Amino acid sequence: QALKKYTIDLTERAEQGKLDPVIGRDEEIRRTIQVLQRRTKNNPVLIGEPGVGKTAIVEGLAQRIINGEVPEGLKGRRVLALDMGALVAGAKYRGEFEERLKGVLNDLAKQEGNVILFIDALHTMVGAGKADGAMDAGNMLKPALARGELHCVGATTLDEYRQYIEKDAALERRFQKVFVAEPSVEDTIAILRGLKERYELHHHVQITDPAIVAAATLSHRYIADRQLPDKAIDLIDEAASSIRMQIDSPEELDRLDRRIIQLKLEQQALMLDMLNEELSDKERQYSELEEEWKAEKASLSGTQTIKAELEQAKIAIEQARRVGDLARMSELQYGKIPELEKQLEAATQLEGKTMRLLRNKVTDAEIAEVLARWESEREKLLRMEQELHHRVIGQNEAVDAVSNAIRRSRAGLADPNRPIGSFLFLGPTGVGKTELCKALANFMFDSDEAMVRIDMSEFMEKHSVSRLVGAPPGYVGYEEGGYLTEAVRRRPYSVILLDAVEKAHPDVFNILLQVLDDGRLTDGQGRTVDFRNTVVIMTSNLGSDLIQERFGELDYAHMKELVLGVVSHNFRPEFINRIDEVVVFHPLGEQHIASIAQIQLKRLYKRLEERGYEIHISDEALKLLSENGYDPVYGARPLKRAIQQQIENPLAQQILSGELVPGKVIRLEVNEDRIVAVQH
Amino acid sequence: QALKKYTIDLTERAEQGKLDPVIGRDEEIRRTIQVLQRRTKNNPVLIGEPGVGKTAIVEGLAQRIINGEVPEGLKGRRVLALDMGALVAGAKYRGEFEERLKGVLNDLAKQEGNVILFIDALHTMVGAGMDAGNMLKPALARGELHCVGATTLDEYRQYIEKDAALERRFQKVFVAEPSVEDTIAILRGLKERYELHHHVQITDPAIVAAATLSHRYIADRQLPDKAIDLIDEAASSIRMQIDSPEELDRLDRRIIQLKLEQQALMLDMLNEELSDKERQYSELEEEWKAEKASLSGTQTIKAELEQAKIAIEQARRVGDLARMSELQYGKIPELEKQLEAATQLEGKTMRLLRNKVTDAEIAEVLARWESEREKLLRMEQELHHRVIGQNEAVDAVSNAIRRSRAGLADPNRPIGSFLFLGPTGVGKTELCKALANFMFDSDEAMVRIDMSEFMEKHSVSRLVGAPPGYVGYEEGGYLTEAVRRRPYSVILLDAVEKAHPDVFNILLQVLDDGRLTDGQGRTVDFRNTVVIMTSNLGSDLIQERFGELDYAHMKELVLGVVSHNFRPEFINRIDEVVVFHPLGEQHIASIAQIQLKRLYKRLEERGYEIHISDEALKLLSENGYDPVYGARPLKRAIQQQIENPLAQQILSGELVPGKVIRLEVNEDRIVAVQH
C-alpha cells in the first residue's frame, strides 16, 4: 500500500508509545479541534516560531486520540505524517514520484477523511517543490483542497505564511491562522519535569529540579534564538552527555599511569634503583583506584538498569490502564513502584556514600558550566562601584551619585514606567563624560557599542524631531530609520547621550518629556519603542563657567544646588525635575591629567614594545606635559595633541633617524621646553 | 489533459450539490450574463475587496446554469476555474510556464466554444516573467475564450490600467458589499447547512446578533465571510462541548481513586461511598447517552429535511406534478414541527449544555478572536470612579455622549467639540484619559497635539500635511496619520491660544465636515472621534472668583473673555466650554491619596506591607502643592520625597517584606518603621 510506503503514522507510534508525552496546551488543542470539525475553512496551520512543540502539538493530539480524549468524530481517525524526501527516494522520471503521490491521494480517497494527515511547512511545500517535466505536492494536492479528502494540519512561521500562503485565494480560504503563543517559564518547567525521566533513562544520570528551574531562568535570560522548550531541552541533554563524559573519565588515573610508565622507562633503562619499590607503591595505588572506579561504574550500572525497570513498569501499568487487566493494576502499582523507588534511593544513597570521583545529579553549577561553554544585584552593585574608578579617574561625588541612581534603578521600587536613565551631567569638556557613558555601558550593558551618540547641538533648527525621530518623508533619515528612535529600534539595550542641551528647541524638551514619562515614544512611522531598558544622559555647559571658576574652595552639594538653579534659569523647571539626578563634573586638575597622560604613555610603550622599544618618562617631563596639555576650557584634547607633537615628533624623528637602539632604557629627559630621549 | 491538471468543474460540484446555494446579487449576475453573451470583449472582471464572495457569485451563476435560468447561448456550457499561481510556480527555466499556458489554450480550443473560464488574481497574471497576458491576448480578443476576472479595485488601478489589451480584453462588472439585512437572509439560507454539518441547532436572534457584533467589533473582515467564521467556530465550539464530560471525568477519577484506596485497605465505608459515586456516575453517563441519542435523531431528521428540500428542487427542475405538492405540503411542515419538538425537548434535556448557539458564544468567539447603553446610563458614575470633582463637566460630557450614541444631532458633525479652560494640573488630561477609557477603550489610546508650538504658515503645513513635492510629505500631517491609524480615539489640543488663527479654519472644517482633506489627497474622517481643545485663558479669573460663584455666570464671564480672545465663528461652533475650576485642597489631597494607592500597589508589586500616618499624608499634600500649576508639582514632589529616602533605606538593608511599615513623620519629612 502507498500508505505503507512513505507515511509516518503518529497514532501508531503513540500506540507504541514512541512519541513523547506532551504536556499542557489544552486551550490550543481545543481551539485546534474547533478548527478541525468545521464545515468550511477546514485545514489548520500552526503559526509560530521554529522550535516550539508545534510538531508536539500534533503528536499530543494523536496521544489524546490513543487515550480517547477527543470527541467522537475524531475517534477512529488516523493521524499520519507524510515525508517529502521519502517519496523522492527512488523516483526522478516523468511522473513516478507524482504517480506515488497521486496513489497516496487515491488512498486518501479510499479512506474519505478517515486519515487526518499532517505536513508542516506548507509554504515550503508550495514554493520549493521544483520538478522537471513533473509537478509538486502543492499543485497536486491543491485539488484535495477543493475535494474535501484533505483535513490536513500545517505549521509555519509568521512571515512565510504571509509570503507564500496568504497571497493565493484557495490557499487562503482552505486555511486558518491558528496562532500559537509563546509559552511561559513554569509550563516549560512542568514539561521538563514530565520528560526528565526519559532523559535520565537515555543518559544514565539524575537531574536536579532546582537545576531545572535555574536552567529555565538562565535560558530565558541569556539564550536568544532558541526557544521553548528547545533551549531547556538542549541544556538538559547536553549537560547529561557532559556528565556522561565525566562518567567515562577519571584524571588521577592518567596522572598515575603517566607516572608509572615514566618510572618504568627509567627502571628499564637502569637495568641503586629504589624505583621497583616506588613502582610497586604507585601500581598498587593505581590498581586500588581502578577497582574503585569499576565498582562505582557497576553501582551506576545497576542503578540505571533498575531506573529503566521503574520506567518500564510505568509503561506497563499505563498499558494496563489502556487495556484493563484486573490484578495487573494493583499488582504492578503496590508491588513494583514503592520497592523500586526505595531501592533506587538506596542505590542513590549508596552512590552518595561512594561518589568520590564521579557525579550523576546534574546540578545548577553544571548548567552554569554548560552555559559558560555555551549573582546579579549586590555583585553588580559592588563591582559597578569598583569599575567606576578604573577608566574614569576621580569624580568620586559623581561616582557615588550615579551609584545611588543605578541602585534605585535596579531596585525597581521607583516608577518602573519611567526609563532607567535620566541624567544631566554638568561640567566642562574633556572630562570623562563620554568615558563615563562608555564605562556605564561597560558594566551595566557590559560592552562598548551599547550606546548611541547624538548631540543636541545640531538640533537648534526647527526640524529636530523630524530628522531625529522620524517624519513624513521627503527626508534622508527615513529609509535609514532615523537618528535616535530607530537606532533604539536597532539597539533596544543601549545608553543615550544628549550633548549640548543648551542648543535646544521646543521640539526637544517635549520629546524628552515623553521619554521621561513614558519610555515608549511616538515616532513618525507610528511604532513606539520603549526606553525602559536604556539609559538617557544629557550634558551641558551653562553653569560650567561657574564649575570651571569656583570648584576650588567650594563644596559639591551647594554647588549642585546653585547650578541646578542656573539650569532652572535656562530651562523650564518642569523639564528638569523628571530627571533622576543632575550632577557636576569638576575640572580635572593635576593627578587626573598625570594618570591619563600616563595611560597614553603606557599604550605608547605598548606599541613600541610591538616595535621592540623600552622607554621611561621623567616626571619633570610629566609636569611640563601637565602644563602644556591642560587648558581651563577643553582639557584632554590639548593634552592629546601636546603628547602627539612634543613626544611623537622628536621620537619618530629620531627612530627613523636610526639613532636609537632597541633594548636600551630610553629615558625621556627634559629639554628646556621639550623632551629628549637618551640611550643608556 | 491540462483541464484535469489545472481546472475545477464547479458545475460538477454544484451538480452534486457541493456548493453554496448563493443568495441575492441578481443584478450583477445578470450584467455578467450580459457581458458573457457579447460578440467581442467577452470577458467580465469582478472588482471588489476579497471576502465579498465574487467566487461565490460565479458559483451561484453556475448553480443557475444547473437550474438552467440562462439565455440561449449558455445552455450546455461548462464553467471551469483556474489559478495563475498553479502556472507560475513551475518555472524553472525559460518556456515551462508557457507550454502549460498554450496547452491550456489547446484544450480550450479543443472543447470548441463550450467552456466558460474563470481566473481570479488577475493582477497576479500581470507579472510572471512577455509572460502571461500576451499569450492570452488572441483568445481574449477573438471571442475564443470567455474569461471571468476577480480582483480588487486597488490592484485594478495599479495593474490593469497599464496594458491596454489587459484593459479592453476585459470588462468591468462592479461588485458591491452586502448589506445588513441581506446578510441576515443569506445566513437564513445558510442556517440549515450549518445545522446539518455541526449536528446542532442555531438561535436565529443570535444570528442577527452575530451580524450586529460582526459589524460592531470587527474592522477587517466583512460579509458574508466574518459571520460565516463566527457561526462556524461557535458551532464547532458547541459541538465540542456536546461531544465530550467534565463531571463524568471528576466522578471517574474519584471512583478509580477510591477503588485503589479500597484495594489497599483490604472500618471500610468505601464500598458504600464507591457504590454511591458509581451510581451517580452511571446516572450522568445514561443522561449523556440519552442526550446524544436525542441529538442523533434530531440531526438525522434535519438531514432528511434537507434531502427533502433537495428532492423538491430536483422536482422543480424535472417537473413532477404530484411530487411537488406531496413533498411540500406533507414533508415540510411535519418535519419542521417535530424538529421544533426536538428543539424544545433538547432545551429540556441538555443540562450538563445546549445545542442552540447563543450570542454569548458569539461574544466568546469575538472577544477571544453587552452593557454599553446601560453603562452610558451610569456614565457619570464611571467618570467619577476615577476623577474627583468637576461634576458639571462630567454631566455635560455625558450629555454629549448620550446625544451621540442616541444620535440626535447632525451625524456628519463630530462627536466631541469642547474647548477647555482654567489652570491645569487638576486632572484635565486625567479626565481625557479616563474619558477615553470608560467611554471607549483606554487612557492613552488617544492623540495629543502640542498646539503651543504651531505659530506660523509652515507650522500649519506641518500639522495639516505638506503639499506633494515638498518637505514633509509621505506620512501625512502630524494629525493625519494620528487619526487615520486611530479610527476611534480622542483628539487633544493643548494651548489653542498660542496658535496662529489660521488653524482655527482647519478646526472649522473639522466641525462642519468631519472629513478633512490633507496634503495627501485623502480625507481622514473625525466623525467617530472626539475633539478636545484645551487652554488656560481664564485661569486666574476662576482662581480669584471660584469662591461662592456659580457655574453658569462664571462660564459666561470667561466665555466673554474668550470672545475677547477668539473668533466669533469659532465660539459659534463650540458645543460647550466647561469651567475646570480649581477643586480644593482636600480633593487634590485625595488625588494625592490615589497616587499613594497606585504607589502602594507598586509596593505590593514589590511585595511590601506599608502604611502611613495621615499627618504624613497632609505634609505630603502640603509639599509640592501650588494653585499656579495644579497637582503635578505636588505629584512629582511627593514622588521624589518618597522614592528617594524610602528606597534609600530599602537599599540600606532595613525594610523587610512582611513587617509593619508605618510611614511616620519626621519633623518635616517621613520615615518608615520596621515592626
Binding site: - | 518555472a91 524553472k92 525559460r94 516573467g129 513635492g469 515638498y470 518637505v471 509621505e474
Partner: peptide, 24 residues
C-alpha cells in the same frame, strides 16, 4: 543511458526609485 541536458535559467534584477523634496 542519458545525458545531463543543458538548461535555460531565466534570471532577473530590479531598480530603486528616488523622490526629491523642495526646500521652500
Amino acid at each position: 543511458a542519458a545525458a545531463a541536458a543543458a538548461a535555460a535559467a531565466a534570471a532577473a534584477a530590479a531598480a530603486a526609485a528616488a523622490a526629491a523634496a523642495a526646500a521652500a
